[PDB]
Ligand binder design. Structure first.
Ligand SMILES: O=c1ccn([C@@H]2O[C@H](COP(=O)(O)OP(=O)(O)O[C@H]3O[C@H](CO)[C@@H](O)[C@H](O)[C@H]3O)[C@@H](O)[C@H]2O)c(=O)[nH]1
Ligand SMILES: O=c1ccn([C@@H]2O[C@H](COP(=O)(O)OP(=O)(O)O[C@H]3O[C@H](CO)[C@@H](O)[C@H](O)[C@H]3O)[C@@H](O)[C@H]2O)c(=O)[nH]1
Lengths: 452, 449, 449, 452
């Protein structure tokens, strides 16, 4: 019956993101509890902050500065994030970080225990909480527990470099259900596990390792098509309505993401440079806007990527700019999601070219936001999880800047008929694998496990 | 009475060049000067004749270039004279090459010289030139003009070879500077080393060598600036004149070098954006700066920093439909730049140190006197001694620069008119023609040794 | 039954070269290979003959060099194959040039080929070489040996041209790798693209093309290493042998490249100094690393960082009479390096990724078996599959590396002996002679198409 | 009668530096009070911390983090220090910094007032307290107040770039007595004042500006020769005694200072490089040791110079180093002054080549520390204040690295007879202008002013 969801952050009643709509859909159906970090530092030793509306309860706690630094800044974001995105060169393994990561998981488990009921189903989200099922088991919780990894799971040759990889695998197997964005992530997890210990598998997705039974499954996260199309078709704020009108004979190429090195933003700028260099006929007639709010700015590698991006914006505009034409608009700013939907609708090209992305919701949002009668074009990296389902996109390899540039040109000149075709085929896939479908499949699978 | 001018680079228009040509057109004579590469190391000089002027040019070796021009002149003299001892990179092989090429240049000029010539030498690459001429017996009236600042003793005396440089400069009969403070700095430097006697106004003796000093602040040709500024824009440029009906333009153009204080400028615009949010969406700062002298130690670390700062500032303050800062690392025709000046509401000229800065004067000569923009000018620019009606600022105080910018953007037509008319009267009175004529007339008056 | 070897750079000694020479001395034949500059772009190949071996070399254009060797091979293939996709810099002009030069090289070799030849191609610059040979009708047995790692699909498939590279590699009759995991990675890459059939042990079909794969971990010549190591030091070098009676020496030598994890190494020594203060004044870490391939994008940003880190670490932990870290950016003779190995108490070989790493094997072959040092070896070095008795570490865990270092410095003679004797037996059994003979014998067994 | 001294830091009874011995000499003679910052951040609102031994009292206060940042880190060390050392390119003028600088001076004056007596003579030290006389006057203190500037005072063309230069001059004239290290500093101050306002001068050193009367004077700070020679002749700690013996056929070149950009440390390393390059006969037979403890490490320009120095040490040793010979020993470490005296005595060459230095006590310490019967050689920059009196040093221009290298070679090979001559002439100058002489002259001059 009751659903408990915990994740690193939680969204209480009063700007609803992609994951939030999914969690809330699940919680609204079952009723239950959403538990996680308040996003605040300091004053940890105040009671849990609780809200209750109808059937759902929201609960949060603060974290100390040390715990945040070792758990979130260091281990999560400077070890697991770079490794799981195939950047060994960036991980900063240190023992205190690893100890902090275990400490906060144990802390969270301790806070959570009194709030649990015997029949609860428990859903844990993301790489911050890899050890969490294990911490629950050692505290006597026998409940069904599922995990969803929102990011890629790396192959053995990368995963096995983590000094702590073996402990991570052992603890992952304390979940009854492990969910991944793509088939390759699930396979990679099983591949790392099989390299470490004997695994017994039945029908691809049911396993035993060290005598522990667990299932695996793929649930590619999605969007709410009806909500996005509503938001997207709504009027722009007055100042932005004015701008849309002023851009009548300007084609807009648009990108938005957190400012992360996984997103390949410099490589993208270089591709835009390549478009400007080799297709001069677009000069003065196109614009590329990149919205990239700072993310995890306490972490050196994130400051580094931001500085690199600032330089490239200045260099490209410095070289291809004219007195009355700025080629590249770079905004280190966060935009409301409801507004982004409107901006996607008026953008001729959506450019989503990450080097590695668990899924990438921006790509699904962009084509849901389109006017089906006059849709823009998605240019999508083959390394985004989304590329598995959005095969009608212009799929590209961001390591070949000339290919990305060619695809940008192709997108800018595509006929109405072909834009519609490609759009309708993508939209059909994302309407058939909804965010509702995504949470319903996960919860249905979780309810099926016979608890220990 | 022939005039022989020599200067670094030549021209078979510009600003200094109109002054040299004007001086040559009056007297008749010869312009003698260098031209980069090599094209041909061991070749006869280029003797090309118009009517009164005879034009002669010559090459160089890549070894001479590096020690002479790329090293001593531009890695010791230029940074030191602009108050940056931290940027001097003295090596004796380069001092030696500096003297070598001066002596070479002197060797090629000697044959082309006539007894009754008056001779006029330009700028810091040729501080030693009159000494090398004296060593060859030439007794002619020779004058020097220094285009950059002359530093105070506490800076100049750090130069390992300051005392030679000082002995050599006193072989000129006349030494011209852009400001009184440059003239005084030189005299103070010379006074710290040796006894100098001033028996009458601006007339000196040191080590028994007689010489004069004087101030000739280089000027502009106001008519031609106004003519060029007034002309029709290229089509694509008149597409953003009435597109920015409600957007005011702050404008700067210069060479990339450490003396111009470009990052400091970006910081000042940031401070304007930060503390005066009224202006968002309604102003723009455009900076043009073509790369220069990235050959030795490459000041090009400043290009990189400007790229970063444009990206940073735009990323913070920009909007989907508004880019606060336009940074262009591109070459623009002089003619077009004159038109941009005219259509820009604010001229931002804030070097950290500048001999004169002709851009400040061009900006106000290019203005429509009926509806002129405002000049914001650094007090460390030599032009600030005369352009007293400019908004004068200390670039080390970015908030003062921002407040000036705010003041310039809100200034009434009446005040914009009287400030501009005031500056303009000054530039018309001391034009490039007046400048050259004053220097020549003074040089002519000297009795040769 | 002739052997034709081709490899990048040649030699009219080393390690691979003794293997190629040994294989050529047995069969007789020809070594065919490149040599940098140009010296002469359009010149006949260099046909120099000993007795059984005939040696042929040729030049190249600076455009071919940059796209072929400086770009695709070393800016795409090398970083990708060492698990650094973030360092790949793919441009199609360089892919094209990569194919161009392979085809050129194939054109010059064709005439020098004989019907009954066996052919042996070395390393990643020539992945396409057997395809270009097939296009010219040569049906000979051709084998390939890859000296560097072959990456897993998740890395390899990122290469814009991975599928061509895969089709081309299957034109070799035999493909040799340094480890089982490289062999498996290749097969997994090929399996992701197309159906491959393995009807019998290590024998495959793909697109109807038959080929074999196998593991030949490159080895050393143990006798000559021991001989060179045992010889008398140059005087000045035997001045610090018994000056450091009470000071133990940790020693590493390699090329500067990102795969070697040099800054990570310095960090590990710091962690040793930080957490084991017993060792202060009593140990030293010496790193030799000559600069390499600073031509394109210049990994030389690592030189700079090592300079910084040596200065930082010594500045923190040094004393008036003790320098913890000796970093030398200098070339040392092979002979001398063998002697340094022998007199060093700890051999530190901790690359982030390495095909094999011959230094690990040299270090233990050079040891006095009566009083040998300890090898600390990265698990990411191909040599770690065989040198199981080494102290095996994860360089991503600097404290584990430090603890290994501490363990190596305190290790009893008895344990130092059995670990070394164990590693040494392995290197003697699989020596450079065994390696070449195994590859040749397998290549000979194939029935030509 | 009673002397009050205030300075940014104070030295209570229980390692006595150069300035401290001078202050304490003065205080011991008059009796009185030494007042200043404790060096501690936080908990400002605890009572003044007071000690009393015989006739002297020591008093200190803590400063808040904000006050420290704006007063000490920002205005003092990132504006006044770079400007007064001719580095306009490094000053970081911002209004809040300037306001903080005034605030802390006012704060110090407020703390100090109740502790004053009508007949006190008051001695203020250094650029942190330029406004301090002024703050005292506005609080009704008529006492004789003297100031000593320990660093250079820059010419008008540099001074006048400080946005706040005019206020600084006005406030300086509230002192009855202003003391400088050299005649050029005093002249430079008067030059800046004369450029701003009409100054009336009698007999060079007695002035009026804005109707305010004040005197100027030069007091070049010095050393305690008898104490230094005692310390220097004492036995080395056992481990260092061992090292001295092991270096019998090695010539030592030695330098020590705070790691400051005023000291020209990179330029010095470059000169050592030049010695190694052009005089190879010293290879394996000399060593250069540079001790350079971090100073003001919170300030970006100080982190920058430290990083530059680390790189150059690694590069030089990387290039000229041998398996059993390290050319350059760099220690980012602070050494006790009593020990340094011993190290100076066993060093063949003292290398003191700052780009700009008010005086530089290390240079005077080095020759006081020498065995007069076998003295080492001082190589001294012409830009140290000390060069005015130590004319028998090998005087050099650090902007000419080949000249410094030549002087190093000359020093390394100098005959006993010439070493003795040069040493004895320097020692005579520093024994005749003692630290005792320095404080006695200052106090004698201060007692002479007729208080307002
Ligand atoms: O200014 C901004 C920037 C982004 N977004 C929204 O933020 C979300 C970004 O999600 P996504 O594009 O998926 O990227 P990620 O931030 O990286 O989040 C991680 O989690 C998502 C959920 O599983 C996966 O799709 C990703 O691959 C995973 O890296 C989208 O809904 C955006 O519309 C905003 O609302 N405002
Ligand atoms: O590890 C160290 C480093 C230095 N010192 C001592 O610190 C003092 C340094 O004083 P100085 O050589 O004069 O340099 P500064 O630190 O710069 O101090 C400033 O104040 C001194 C007193 O007026 C003037 O000589 C300087 O020119 C001025 O810049 C000397 O007594 C050194 O022996 C130590 O005891 N241990």
């Amino acid at each position: 019956s009751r659903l408990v969801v915990v994740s690193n952050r939680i969204a209480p009643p009063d700007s609803a993101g992609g994951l939030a709509v999914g969690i809330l859909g699940a919680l609204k159906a079952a009723g239950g509890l959403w538990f996680g970090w308040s996003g605040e530092t300091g004053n940890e030793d105040q009671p849990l902050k609780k809200v209750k509306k109808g059937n759902i309860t929201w609960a949060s706690f603060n974290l100390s500065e040390q715990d945040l630094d070792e758990y979130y800044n260091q281990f999560s974001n400077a070890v697991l994030w770079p490794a799981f995105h195939y950047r060994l060169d960036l991980v900063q393994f240190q023992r205190p970080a690893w100890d902090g990561y275990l400490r906060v998981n144990a802390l969270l488990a301790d806070k959570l225990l009194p709030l649990l009921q015997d029949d609860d189903i428990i859903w844990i989200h993301d790489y911050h909480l890899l050890p969490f099922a294990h911490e629950l088991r050692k505290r006597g919780v026998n409940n069904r527990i599922g995990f969803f990894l929102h990011i890629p799971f790396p192959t053995p040759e990368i995963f096995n470099a983590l000094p702590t990889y073996d402990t991570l695998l052992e603890q992952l197997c304390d979940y009854d259900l492990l969910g991944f964005q793509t088939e390759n992530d699930r396979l990679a997890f099983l591949d790392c596990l099989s390299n470490l210990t004997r695994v017994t598998t039945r029908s691809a997705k049911s396993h035993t390792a060290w005598g522990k039974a667990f299932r695996t499954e793929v649930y590619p996260i999605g969007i709410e098509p009806k909500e996005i199309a509503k938001q997207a078709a709504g009027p722009l704020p007055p100042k932005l309505a004015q701008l849309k009108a002023e851009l009548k004979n300007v084609q807009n190429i648009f990108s938005v993401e957190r400012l992360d090195y996984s997103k390949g933003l410099p490589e993208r700028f270089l591709a835009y440079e390549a478009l400007l260099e080799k297709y001069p006929q677009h000069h003065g007639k196109i614009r590329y806007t990149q919205i990239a709010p700072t993310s995890r700015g306490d972490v050196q590698a994130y400051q580094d990527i931001r500085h690199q991006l600032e330089n490239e914006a200045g260099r490209i505009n410095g070289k291809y700019g004219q007195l009355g034409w700025t080629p590249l608009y770079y905004l280190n700013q966060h935009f409301d999601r409801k507004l982004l939907m409107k901006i996607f609708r008026y953008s001729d090209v959506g450019l989503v070219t990450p080097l590695r992305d668990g899924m990438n919701l921006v790509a699904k949002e962009y084509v849901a936001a389109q006017d089906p009668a006059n849709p823009g074009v998605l240019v999508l990296s083959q390394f985004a999880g989304a590329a598995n389902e959005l095969t009608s996109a212009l799929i590209v390899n961001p390591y070949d800047r000339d290919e990305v540039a060619a695809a940008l040109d192709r997108a800018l000149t595509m006929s109405l008929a072909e834009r519609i075709s490609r759009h309708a085929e993508m939209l059909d896939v994302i309407v058939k694998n909804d965010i509702n479908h995504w949470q319903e499949c996960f919860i249905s699978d979780l309810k099926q496990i016979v608890p220990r």
